[PDB]
Design a protein around this nucleic acid. Structure first.
Length: 139
DNA sequence: ACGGTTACGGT
């Protein structure tokens, strides 16, 4: 395998990437992240800066992807991965939601068939240098 | 059934 920029991923494949967590949302069914590497993808939602009432502060346009975490991925991350953290996600599955937007999914995988994972990366890892420099262009 | 639909809500 190898890592891809969010700009390079497409629907219905397995992929790995480094990203920054912008937004998290827990429910009693799953844990959801919205992550960016500050590269654009035409299948991402165009986040608006004009919204009345939003805690989103960017990036705006098509720069972030929703990640739905199920089961062990959910339970592990829900009280651990926080907005602003950096993460590395490996071998996750992509699909398209009902409105045609790219989206990434971590199903429960007890049989350990897929080797999926998500861990925090220390804010200072040099693997984050690109995300950090690109971010400079949008702030 | 292996699920949750919409870019907020801020649980």
């Amino acid at each position: 395998d190898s890592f891809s920029l969010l700009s390079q991923i497409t629907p219905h494949q397995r992929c790995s990437f480094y990203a920054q967590v912008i937004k998290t949302w827990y429910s009693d069914k799953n844990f959801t992240l919205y992550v960016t590497d500050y590269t654009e993808n035409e299948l991402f939602f165009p986040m608006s800066p004009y919204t009345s009432s939003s805690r989103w502060r960017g990036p705006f346009g098509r720069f972030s992807i929703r990640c739905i975490l199920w089961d062990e991925h959910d339970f592990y991350c829900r009280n651990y991965i926080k907005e602003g953290d950096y993460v590395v996600m490996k071998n996750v599955r992509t699909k398209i939601d009902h409105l045609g937007y790219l989206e990434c999914i971590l199903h429960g995988d007890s049989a350990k068939r897929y080797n999926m994972s998500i861990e925090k990366v220390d804010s200072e890892e040099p693997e984050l240098n690109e995300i950090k420099s690109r971010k400079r262009l949008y702030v």
